[PDB]
Amino acid sequence: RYRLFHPVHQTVPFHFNPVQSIFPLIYENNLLAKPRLSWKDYEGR
Protein backbone atom coordinates (compact mmCIF):
# COMPACT_ATOMS: atom_id res chain seq x y z
CA ARG A 1 0.00 0.00 0.00
CA TYR A 2 1.08 3.62 -0.59
CA ARG A 3 -0.94 5.52 2.01
CA LEU A 4 1.55 5.01 4.81
CA PHE A 5 0.44 5.98 8.29
CA HIS A 6 3.46 6.67 10.47
CA PRO A 7 4.56 9.45 12.78
CA VAL A 8 6.01 11.85 10.19
CA HIS A 9 8.04 12.67 13.26
CA GLN A 10 10.03 9.72 11.82
CA THR A 11 11.01 11.22 8.47
CA VAL A 12 13.37 13.87 9.84
CA PRO A 13 15.24 11.60 12.25
CA PHE A 14 17.32 13.59 14.71
CA HIS A 15 19.48 10.63 15.62
CA PHE A 16 22.49 12.22 13.93
CA ASN A 17 21.79 15.97 14.28
CA PRO A 18 20.88 16.85 17.86
CA VAL A 19 21.68 20.25 19.31
CA GLN A 20 25.02 18.90 20.42
CA SER A 21 25.81 19.10 16.70
CA ILE A 22 25.05 22.75 16.05
CA PHE A 23 25.57 23.88 19.66
CA PRO A 24 28.55 21.72 20.59
CA LEU A 25 28.77 22.91 24.20
CA ILE A 26 25.23 22.91 25.51
CA TYR A 27 25.58 20.23 28.17
CA GLU A 28 28.35 22.57 29.02
CA ASN A 29 26.02 25.40 29.64
CA ASN A 30 28.02 28.08 27.79
CA LEU A 31 25.84 27.71 24.68
CA LEU A 32 28.19 28.36 21.78
CA ALA A 33 26.83 28.37 18.23
CA LYS A 34 29.06 26.66 15.64
CA PRO A 35 26.77 25.80 12.71
CA ARG A 36 27.44 25.06 9.05
CA LEU A 37 25.91 28.12 7.47
CA SER A 38 25.50 27.07 3.85
CA TRP A 39 26.51 24.59 1.22
CA LYS A 40 28.14 27.62 -0.40
CA ASP A 41 30.61 28.34 2.36
CA TYR A 42 32.31 24.98 1.91
CA GLU A 43 36.00 25.89 1.89
CA GLY A 44 37.14 22.71 0.18
CA ARG A 45 38.78 19.34 0.67
Partner RNA sequence: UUUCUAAUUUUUAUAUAUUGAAGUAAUAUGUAUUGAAUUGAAUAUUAAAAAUACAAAUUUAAUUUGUAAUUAAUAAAUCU
Question: Contact residues for RNA (CB under 7 A)?
Answer: 1-2, 4
**CB of 1 vs RNA, minimal distance in Å:** 6
* Identity of the residue, 4 or 33, whose beta carbon is nearer to RNA in the bound complex: 4
Count the alpha carbons within 13 Å of 3 in the hemisphere toward its beta carbon: 0
Nearest approach, Cβ of 10 to RNA (angstroms)? 10
DSSP letters for 22-43: HSSSSSSTT--------STT--
Our CB check for RNA shows the closer of 2 and 27 to be 2
